[PDB]
Enzyme design. Structure first.
Site, short mmCIF file in Angstrom:
data_model
loop_
_atom_site.label_atom_id
_atom_site.label_comp_id
_atom_site.label_asym_id
_atom_site.label_seq_id
_atom_site.Cartn_x
_atom_site.Cartn_y
_atom_site.Cartn_z
CG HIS A 44 -2.10 -0.91 1.09
ND1 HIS A 44 -2.86 -1.28 2.19
CD2 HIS A 44 -2.64 -1.55 0.03
CE1 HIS A 44 -3.81 -2.11 1.80
NE2 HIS A 44 -3.70 -2.29 0.49
CG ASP A 58 -0.04 2.97 4.41
OD1 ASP A 58 -0.94 2.83 5.26
OD2 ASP A 58 0.47 2.02 3.80
CG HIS A 89 -3.54 -4.40 6.33
ND1 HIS A 89 -4.72 -3.69 6.24
CD2 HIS A 89 -2.63 -3.69 5.62
CE1 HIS A 89 -4.54 -2.62 5.50
NE2 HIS A 89 -3.28 -2.59 5.11
CB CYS A 121 -1.01 -1.63 7.83
SG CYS A 121 -0.15 -0.12 7.32
CG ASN A 125 -10.25 -0.72 3.16
OD1 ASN A 125 -10.75 -1.75 2.79
ND2 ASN A 125 -10.14 0.31 2.37
C1 9BZ Z 1 -8.79 2.00 8.01
C2 9BZ Z 1 -8.12 3.20 7.31
C3 9BZ Z 1 -8.55 4.53 7.96
S1 9BZ Z 1 -8.44 3.12 5.57
C4 9BZ Z 1 -6.87 2.60 4.98
C5 9BZ Z 1 -6.27 3.48 3.87
S2 9BZ Z 1 -4.58 3.65 4.33
C6 9BZ Z 1 -4.64 2.89 5.91
C7 9BZ Z 1 -4.31 1.39 5.98
S3 9BZ Z 1 -2.99 0.99 4.86
N1 9BZ Z 1 -6.04 2.84 6.14
C8 9BZ Z 1 -6.60 3.14 7.47
C9 9BZ Z 1 -6.19 2.24 8.61
O1 9BZ Z 1 -6.00 1.01 8.43
O2 9BZ Z 1 -6.05 2.78 9.72
ZN ZN Z 2 -2.23 -1.19 4.09
ZN ZN Z 3 -1.49 1.51 6.47
#
Ligand code: 9BZ
Ligand code: ZN
Ligand code: ZN
Length: 219
Positions: A77, A79, A137, A156, A165
């Site tokens: 991903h 991030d 994840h 994550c 997510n």
């Molecule tokens: C659950 C989220 C707010 S949505 C998703 C997009 S980037 C990052 C995970 S890589 N993410 C948030 C999370 O997991 O906290």
């Molecule tokens: Zn991720």
């Molecule tokens: Zn993340």
């Protein structure tokens, strides 16, 4: 607008960097990664969301006399990988698992220049370890362990108050992976999640509990 890149000392030779993005549907997401210092060298543990902040992160350590020796991405991903292209353009070595580089390629994204496969990999021997606990994840998520500080970057994968997510998640496998992770690093002094505050080894248990709870409701 968005908050600025943040860099904070966590332990000796260990820094937390935090970047911020608007993600449609979730609002402002914080992302924690690490910068680990070995002598006069620095390793990025995940890149910030963007080339901009990856650049800011890098100049911050260079201006203070640290050569950037490489980066490692904990999953595919943005991030964790958003800064790979910029790092590649500066000939700073980038690392990811074979699976991560495969998932990046499938998405039409830039790959890390160096890859590794297998359950364990030393980015720096006896200093920075990469471990694959199994799918959670994402299929490819790994953690990074610092044996000298007993610090675990959970990435994550660590989701203590809810899984977030599940788009690319493996809900069946996640409890088993989390149990393996807990087994291996139960003696972690600190655990650093991507999207929540630093805690201790209890974050491993909560992640397992959230994973198990997540699976049952799926059924
Ligand atoms: C659950 C989220 C707010 S949505 C998703 C997009 S980037 C990052 C995970 S890589 N993410 C948030 C999370 O997991 O906290
Ligand atoms: Zn991720
Ligand atoms: Zn993340």
């Amino acid at each position: 607008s968005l908050p600025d890149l943040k860099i904070e000392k966590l332990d000796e030779g260990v820094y937390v960097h935090t970047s911020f993005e608007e993600v449609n549907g979730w609002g402002v997401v914080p992302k924690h990664g690490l910068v680990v210092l070995v002598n006069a060298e620095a390793y990025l543990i995940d890149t910030p969301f963007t080339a901009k902040d990856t650049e800011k992160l890098v100049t911050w350590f260079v201006e203070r006399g640290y050569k950037i020796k490489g980066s490692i991405s904990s999953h595919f991903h943005s991030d964790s990988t958003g800064g790979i292209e910029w790092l590649n353009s500066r000939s700073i070595p980038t690392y990811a698992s074979e699976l991560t580089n495969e998932l990046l390629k499938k998405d039409g994204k830039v790959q890390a220049t160096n890859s590794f496969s297998g359950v364990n990999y030393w980015l720096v021997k006896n200093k920075i370890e990469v471990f694959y606990p199994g799918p959670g994840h994402t299929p490819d998520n790994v953690v990074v362990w610092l044996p000298e500080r007993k610090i675990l970057f959970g990435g994550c994968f660590i989701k203590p108050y809810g899984l977030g997510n599940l788009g690319d998640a493996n809900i069946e496998a996640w409890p088993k992976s989390a149990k393996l992770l807990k087994s291996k690093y139960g003696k972690a002094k600190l655990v650093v999640p991507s999207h929540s505050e630093v805690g201790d080894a209890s974050l491993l248990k909560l992640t397992l509990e959230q994973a198990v709870k997540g699976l049952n409701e799926s059924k």
